Amino acid sequence: YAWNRKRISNCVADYSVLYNSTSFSTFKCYGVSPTKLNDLCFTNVYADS
Amino acid sequence: FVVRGDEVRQIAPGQTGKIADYNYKLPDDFTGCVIAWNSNNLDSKVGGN
């Protein structure tokens, strides 16, 4: 109900670092394919955790 | 092969993750089928297989 939201700021978004941290049961992606997530730059990103 | 449960969703044409990037990598024109079933009764030892 009171979900958080944060800026990500300057970053390299490599999910490979998270691989031996936990296995994501749900990783559905919309408008962007997961395979292309490593070939992209994002002007704005929000977490919504 | 045998995988972790939370990773069965990674056995699909377009997927990213340790299985879909370093291990198996189903093609984009697979034209087959993926059967997967829980085998915690078979591939699990009381001390961990």
Ligand SMILES: *[C@@H]1O[C@H](CO)[C@@H](O)[C@H](O)[C@H]1NC(C)=O
């Ligand atoms: C991260 O890598 C280390 C080194 O092998 C491993 O022991 C650890 O279990 C890995 N993390 C997870 C969550 O498996």
Ligand SMILES: *[C@@H]1O[C@H](CO)[C@@H](O)[C@H](O)[C@H]1NC(C)=O
């Ligand atoms: C997450 O935080 C805990 C506690 O600080 C730490 O033990 C663990 O290694 C951290 N995991 C990762 C992937 O950074």
